[PDB]
From a paper:
Triosephosphate isomerase (TPI) deficiency (TPI Df) is an untreatable glycolytic enzymopathy that results in hemolytic anemia, progressive muscular impairment and irreversible brain damage. TPI is a homodimer with each monomer adopting the (βα)8 TIM barrel fold. Transitions between the open and closed state of the catalytic lid are coordinated with changes in the positions of prominent residues within the active site including E165, K13, H95 and S96.
We observed this in both subunits of the dimer; however, the affected regions were not identical, with residues 170-177 being disordered in subunit A, whereas residues 172-179 were disordered in subunit B. The electron density was clearer for the P181 residue in subunit A (inset), and thus we use this subunit in our figures and description unless otherwise noted. A proline at position 181 not only disrupts these interactions but also introduces a kink in the main chain, which prevents residues 177-181 from adopting the helical conformation observed in wild-type TPI structures. We crystallized TPIQ181P in the presence of bromide, which we have shown previously to localize in the active site along with a phosphate abstracted from solution. In our TPIQ181P structure, however, we observed only partial occupancy for bromide ions, and no phosphates were observed. Further, we found that residues E165 and S96 adopted the open conformation.
Numbering used by the authors:
A (entry chain A): 1 to 169, 178 to 248
B (entry chain B): 3 to 171, 180 to 248
Write the structure that this text describes.
Amino acid sequence: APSRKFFVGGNWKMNGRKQSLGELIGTLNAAKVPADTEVVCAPPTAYIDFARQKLDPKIAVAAQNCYKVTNGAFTGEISPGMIKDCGATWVVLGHSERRHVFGESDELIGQKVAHALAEGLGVIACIGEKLDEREAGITEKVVFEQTKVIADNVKDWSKVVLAYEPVWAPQPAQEVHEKLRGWLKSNVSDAVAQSTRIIYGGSVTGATCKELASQPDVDGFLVGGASLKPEFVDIINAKQ
Amino acid sequence: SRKFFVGGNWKMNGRKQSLGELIGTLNAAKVPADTEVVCAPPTAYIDFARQKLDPKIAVAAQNCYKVTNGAFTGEISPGMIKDCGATWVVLGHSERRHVFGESDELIGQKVAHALAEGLGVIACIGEKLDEREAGITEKVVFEQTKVIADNVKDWSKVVLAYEPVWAIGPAQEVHEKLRGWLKSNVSDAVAQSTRIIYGGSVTGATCKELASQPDVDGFLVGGASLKPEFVDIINAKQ
Ligand SMILES: [Br-]
Ligand SMILES: [Br-]
Ligand SMILES: [Ca+2]
């Protein structure tokens, strides 16, 4: 049915311990996820290896962040090389919490994108405007600036997914996704615009997934709180 | 007297194969009596390292955040660290302060949370070259220490690490001043019992002389912690 393969990422954020995450993983393994959804789970960094060992190999594992060189004097960071060594195949970059709580600049995010892709990871590249920005009427400026930094660091979009986070919060998600796809068409290529998944972040739940997934430019979801809950399986099945 | 303390900060280095080999060499080494050894692996390898290291060596995380769970993509909490079997966290490392912009206020909040959650804390302080050359080392490190101390109720599980950021090639002079700070601003008892470890460059060839200084209680070792000479550093008092 869709033009781009449906993509569902679950961002566990800074939540869970071995016991509770083991239970979450058991539930996902028992769901037998459909072949037509690409599912990725992003555990806290201390649990990437633990989670990859237990999770169904059909579900991919992402790190929630990484740094921009293979090794070095960066206490508290991890590199793409470590992510791959733990069996993870994706990284989430530019998440709103890294930008707005931890002050990660666009320049730094672009450098991380380039390094992660060179190292062979997939990247879930996050963008989004804050409340003050939406109220000031500059949604497009903000998300187009963020997207261009990402694009300037992407040579091959096959392993990139763009995630729009409505940090400020007919469907408003659809309006933004259509504009982002138009940006890709005009500034990268029609082929990249037509093939790149643009997934919706923020507060996706079992109650909103079917309506949002029916929007023509919404290709999936980056799921926060609901990724810890049984309803994540219903989100995976939003197109079934 | 104060138990000699040797921490190895692996920073953002190593993979399972190379860290497994490093751990084998540490497991085979004889750790002297009255010496507390701690290794701080990259965050992706805290659990791995704890599983492979002999219990004689403790594991530290290289950083943590200031609440137990929450919407902090990319962070880990003290509860997760303890769940992986680690018993320490390094907080305030110069790279966190200067590359990643962590404020004194944030570091203090992390210290309080990690202690409340049952971890030991290696709390790092230190001046940059421009501060050393301006003559303000003491002012800088005293203020950093004050923010830490305002967040420490019980010093039993705290170790203070002095890292002159520029010392990549004195220590005793600063350690003596920091101990005097503890004496005047906390208590004589805390000053006498708290380990103050040196986190500037330490190698096998410099460790014995540093360890003999009266106010140096051990080391937070950087690059040498990845190398065989870390075992010589563990033996710096022998
Ligand atoms: Br999220
Ligand atoms: Br260090
Ligand atoms: Ca001494």
